[PDB]
Amino acid sequence: FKGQPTPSTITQITRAKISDGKSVRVILSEGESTKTQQFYLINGFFGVAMQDGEKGDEVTLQIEQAEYETDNIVTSEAFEAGKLIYWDNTAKKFTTTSASNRLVGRVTDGKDSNNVIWFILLPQQ
Q: Which residues of the chain form contacts with a copy of itself (CB under 8 A)?
A: 14-21, 24-27, 37-39, 43-45, 48, 62-70, 81-84, 103, 106, 108-109, 118, 120-125
Q: Are 25 and 49 in contact (CB under 8 A)?
A: no
Which residue's CB is nearer to a copy of itself, number 1 or number 123? 123
Q: How far is the CB of 75 from a copy of itself (least distance, A)?
A: 19
Q: Compare residues 10 and 16 and give the one whose CB is closer to a copy of itself.
A: 16
Nearest approach, Cβ of residue 30 and a copy of itself (Å): 16
In the bound state with a copy of itself, the residue whose beta carbon lies nearer, of 95 and 124, is: 124
Q: Choose among 63, 57, 62, 48: nearest CA to 28.
A: 57
The nearest distance, CB 38 to a copy of itself, in angstroms, is 8
40 vs 63: CA distance, rounded Å:
11
Torsion sign, CA atoms 94, 101, 34, 68: positive
Residue placing its CB nearer to a copy of itself in the complex, 14 or 114: 14
- Strands (E) across the chain are located at 23-27, 39-42, 45-49, 58-62, 67-70, 84-88, 93-95, 102-109, 117-121
Q: How far is the CB of 110 from a copy of itself (least distance, A)?
A: 9
3-state secondary structure of 11: coil
